[PDB]
Design a protein around this ligand. Structure first.
Ligand SMILES: O=C(O)c1ccc(Cl)c(Cl)c1
Ligand SMILES: O=C(O)c1ccc(Cl)c(Cl)c1
Lengths: 498, 498
C-alpha cells in the first residue's frame, strides 16, 4: 500500500523546494520540505507529551495552514485523527469525543469548557499551542515512523441521530486520492495549484483536495473563509488549476464570474469538480455558462469515497461508475444479489474494496446494516437509465410511498423551488391516507412575500410533475428546522406539523 | 490491493458491451463481456487439465488476440504467466523453461521439438488448441477465483548471461497501470483506444498498454506485425488516443507521417509515450515536428516499472521522478545511503515499494545485488542537472574508465552515429593503457561506402566531444555481433577485436 504519510513523504523528496501550502491571506507560503519539518516537529512534541500510535485524537477546527500541520503531524506520529465539523454544538462534540474513547482533542474554539465537563478523559489541546501561523513549538528528539498495516485504522470521519464515526483504514488513502486522477483528470506535477474550498473534516476536503494536492507534488491554497469574488481572485493570482466545490459555492462563484466578465482571468482553471446530485438544473446551467475548465460531477460517500461520475454533465443526477468502482442497484431492503429489472428503482450499493471504511466506531449494528457480503449500501435510491447510466433519485429514508408508489421529495422540491415567491421548500410524507403517506409541501416565502396553497398547486399543475406526485397539502412556514448543519431535520419537521 | 484480474473484472461490470479487443487485421472485435467469457472458458479448461494456482506457465507467442486471452486465462485461473520473447533461440527458451521449474508452456512457433528435448517436465501447449481467432475450446464447469496475496507471485518477465526471471507480485499491478494515468495523463473512460504496438512479453507492453487499456474501460487495438503506414492508418481508422512505442517505431512513424502530410488524420492521438533515454536528438526532433499529441518520455525497468519522466521533452536523457517514485543517485558500488554531491555521477537507485519485483526466480545472488535495504539498484549511471532533473548517462556495465575518468560510450555513439557514411557504431573500452582502458570505436559503413580512421577522428575533433572522450582507435567492421535481440554483445565484441 501507499499511506497518506508515505504519499506526502515521497512528494517531499521529489519536490522539496516547491510550494506545498499557500495562505495568500496571511502572506504565508511553505515548501514541501518546510511542511515536512513542521509535521516532524509537531509530531515529536505530541509524542514527547505521551501520545502513542493508534490512539484517537479529535480535531475540531476551521480550515487553516495550522490545522493541516496538526492533522498530518498526528498521522505521522501514528495517532488516528477524528475530524469533526466545528459547526456542531458544544454538547454534540463533547458527546462524540466521549463516545469515541478519544485520548485527546486538538481544538480551535467554551467548546473547551464543555469537553472538560462531559466526563470524557480527553486532554484538551489548543491548536495555537502546537503551531502558530506555520511556526511550531518544538521539543524532544525526532521520533520513529510507526509500522502501518493495510486494514489498520488511519482516520475517522463523521457522517451527515448523532453523526457516526466512520473508520478509514490505511489502505484506503491511495484510491481516495487517485480517483482525482482517473476520474477527474488530475496528473502528477508542480503545475498543480489546488484551491482549498472544501472543509477538511470532509473526506473530499481531506483526501481528494488536500492530500491529492500534496501527493501530486503541487500546492494547496488555504481558504479560511469563503468569499466568492475573493476566491475568483485567488484563481487568477495563484494560477489555480483545479477546484472541488459544493453546489452552493459554485452558484456563488458562477454569478460573481458573470457579474465580473473578463475582469477576472480564470484561464488557469482546468478542473471544476462537484458532488452535484442535489444540484438544481439552473445552477448547473450557470456553471457551464460562466465558469471555465472541464466540469465533473461526482458521486461519493464518506464510507466508500468515489462511486460514480460524469464529464461535462447535462443533468446533475445521472452518472456512471469510474476506476476502482463496482456498482449495482438492488431491490430495497433485499439481499446484495437481488439486482432489479432494468428501469425499476432500487438501492444503490457499491463494492466494499480498498477505499471502503472498515466500520462505524463502537456501532456494530449500524455497521452490519451498511457492510453486507462485501458491499457498501448507500441508502440512496437509483434507476438505470436506458443510456446505461445511474440516475440518483434521493435517499431511501426520504422516499415517500403514497398509494403503493415511490415518490422522491427532491424531485418535487426542484419543481417547487422554481415557483415565484419561494425561498425554501421541503417535501415530506405525512403519516396518513389515500394511504401510507400523503405528499406534503412545506414552503418558506421570500422576504416580504405571501404564498398560497392554491397558487402553488396551480404552479405544480402547469409543471412536468406526474399527477400522483403533486403535493396534497401545503404548509407555509417562516422557517425550516435546520440544526443538522443545514440540512433539514425531515423527521422533526413531520412531528412539528402533524 | 487491486489485482490485474480484479481490474479487468471490474471494468467488465462497468462496460460489458464496450469493445475491449479490436483486431482490424482479422476483422475481429470483442466486447469486455465477451472477453471475460473467453477468459473464463480457457481458464476452466486449463484447470480441467490439471493446472493449479501458483504453478508457472511459460508463454511464448507474438502479439495477438489469442495470446491476450491465454495470458489473462492463466492469470484468472491462478497460474503464473512467464512471458518470453519469441525471438529467443530454441536452446535459450528451452533452458529458461527448464530452469524455471515451469509446469507447462503455451507456445506458437521446432521450438516445440527443443522443449521436449531439454529434459524439462513442461507440458507443451499450442496456442491454437486453447483459443483460435478469439474462439475457445470449452469443457468443464466454471472454476473458483483463487485467493491472491499482495506479495504472492503474479507474473514473470525476463530482463535484457541469460535473461533473468523477475517475479512480479500481485500488489504491483495497480501502480504498474496507474502511472499511465498520473504521469502520462490517461484517464478512465470508453474514449480510450490504445494501440498495441509494444510486445506483450515486456512489462510496458503488458501493464502500461494492455492492462491499462482494459482497466480504464477502453479498447486495445491488437497489432501482430508493425508496418509504419499501416499503423498510422489504424490511428485514423480506430480513433487511437494513445500509443506507447519504441524509439525505432517512432522514427518510422514520424517519417511516414512526414511523407504523408494531412493525407492521414491523426487528431485522435493525444498521447505518444516512449522510453527514450537511448533516443537520439534527431529522432526526437522529428517526433515533435511530425507526430501529434503530448509527448512523454519515460524511464523505467522491468524490476520497478516507472521511475522517471518528462512531458514535452527537449533531450531524451533528462527526466524527473513521478507519482509512486522515490529516487537517489549514489556513489557507484557504495551503500544506498552514500548520496553523491550535486553534479557528481553515480548509480540511479529507486525505492523498492509496491511496484517492485520481489526477486529473480532461483537466483538469490543476483537478487541481493539488486534489492538492497529497500532500494532497487538500476545499474544505470546518472547525474543531477542544475535544473533539478536526472540525466541518465548510460549503463554502469558500459562505462569506460580511462585515465581515472568516467566515459560513457552512448555519448560518443550519438556523436559518431551522425558522421556521414556511418550505419552503426559501438564504443567500447579495450583492456589497455594510457590506462585501465582505451576508448575504441567500432563502426559499420553504409552499404557501398568506405570509412577511414583518420576521417572519423577529424569528424570527432569538429564535434562537441571533450578531448579525453575521443576514440583512440577505430575498427571498421561489416557487422556487429547482435544476438541479444539487437542489442549488441559488448563483451563478445571486445573479445573479437582484442
Ligand atoms: O459526501 C459526499 O457527497 C461525497 C463523499 C465522497 C466523494 Cl468522492 C464524493 Cl464525490 C462526495
Ligand atoms: O524496459 C524499459 O525501458 C522500461 C520498463 C518499464 C517502464 Cl515503465 C519503462 Cl518507461 C521502460
Amino acid at each position: 500500500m501507499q499511506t497518506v504519510n508515505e504519499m506526502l513523504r515521497r512528494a517531499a523528496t521529489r519536490a522539496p523546494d516547491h510550494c506545498a501550502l499557500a495562505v495568500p491571506a496571511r502572506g504565508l507560503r511553505l515548501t514541501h520540505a518546510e511542511l515536512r519539518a513542521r509535521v516532524e516537529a509537531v509530531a515529536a512534541r505530541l509524542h514527547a507529551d505521551g501520545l502513542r500510535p493508534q490512539q484517537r485524537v479529535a480535531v475540531v477546527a476551521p480550515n487553516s495552514a495550522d490545522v493541516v500541520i496538526a492533522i498530518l503531524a498526528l498521522h505521522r506520529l501514528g495517532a488516528v485523527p477524528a475530524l469533526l465539523n466545528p459547526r456542531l454544538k458544544s454538547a454534540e462534540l463533547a458527546e462524540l469525543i466521549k463516545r469515541g474513547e478519544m485520548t485527546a482533542a486538538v481544538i480551535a474554539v467554551q467548546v473547551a469548557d464543555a469537553i472538560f465537563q462531559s466526563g470524557s478523559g480527553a486532554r484538551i489541546i489548543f491548536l495555537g499551542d502546537l503551531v502558530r501561523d506555520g511556526e511550531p513549538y518544538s521539543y524532544g528528539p525526532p521520533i520513529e515512523d510507526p509500522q502501518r498495516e493495510p486494514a489498520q485504522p488511519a482516520f475517522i470521519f463523521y457522517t451527515s441521530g448523532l453523526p457516526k464515526a466512520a473508520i478509514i483504514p490505511q489502505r484506503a488513502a491511495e484510491s481516495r486520492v487517485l480517483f482525482m486522477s482517473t476520474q477527474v483528470g488530475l496528473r502528477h506535477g508542480r503545475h498543480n495549484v489546488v484551491l482549498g474550498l472544501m472543509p477538511l473534516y470532509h473526506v473530499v476536503g481531506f483526501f481528494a483536495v488536500l492530500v491529492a494536492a500534496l501527493a501530486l507534488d503541487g500546492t494547496y491554497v488555504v481558504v479560511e473563509e469563503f468569499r466568492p469574488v475573493d476566491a475568483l481572485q485567488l484563481v487568477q493570482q495563484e494560477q489555480v488549476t483545479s477546484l472541488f466545490a459544493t453546489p452552493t459555492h459554485l452558484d456563488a462563484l458562477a454569478a460573481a464570474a458573470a457579474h465580473a466578465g473578463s475582469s477576472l482571468k480564470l484561464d488557469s482553471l482546468r478542473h471544476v469538480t462537484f458532488a452535484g446530485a442535489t444540484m438544481p438544473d439552473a445552477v448547473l446551467e450557470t456553471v457551464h455558462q460562466h465558469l471555465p475548465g472541464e466540469k465533473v460531477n461526482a458521486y461519493g460517500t464518506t464510507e466508500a469515497m468515489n462511486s460514480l461520475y460524469m464529464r461535462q454533465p447535462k443533468t446533475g443526477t445521472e452518472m456512471a461508475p469510474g476506476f476502482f468502482s463496482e456498482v449495482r442497484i438492488v431491490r430495497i431492503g433485499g439481499g446484495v444479489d437481488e439486482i432489479v429489472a432494468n428501469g425499476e428503482e432500487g438501492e444503490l450499493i457499491v463494492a466494499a474494496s480498498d477505499s471502503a471504511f472498515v466500520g462505524y466506531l463502537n456501532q456494530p449494528q449500524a455497521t452490519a446494516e451498511k457492510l453486507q457480503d462485501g458491499w457498501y449500501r448507500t441508502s440512496d435510491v437509483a434507476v438505470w437509465t436506458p443510456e446505461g447510466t445511474v440516475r440518483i433519485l434521493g435517499r431511501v429514508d426520504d422516499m415517500i410511498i403514497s398509494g403503493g408508489e415511490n415518490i422522491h421529495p427532491s424531485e418535487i422540491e426542484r419543481v417547487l423551488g422554481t415557483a415565484p415567491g419561494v425561498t425554501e421548500v421541503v417535501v415530506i410524507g405525512l403519516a396518513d391516507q389515500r394511504w401510507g403517506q400523503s405528499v406534503t409541501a412545506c414552503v418558506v416565502p421570500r422576504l416580504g412575500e405571501t404564498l398560497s396553497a392554491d397558487a402553488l398547486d396551480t404552479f405544480c399543475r402547469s409543471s412536468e410533475l406526474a399527477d400522483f406526485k403533486r403535493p396534497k397539502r401545503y404548509f407555509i412556514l417562516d422557517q425550516l428546522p435546520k440544526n443538522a448543519l443545514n440540512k433539514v431535520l425531515r423527521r422533526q419537521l413531520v412531528q412539528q406539523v402533524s
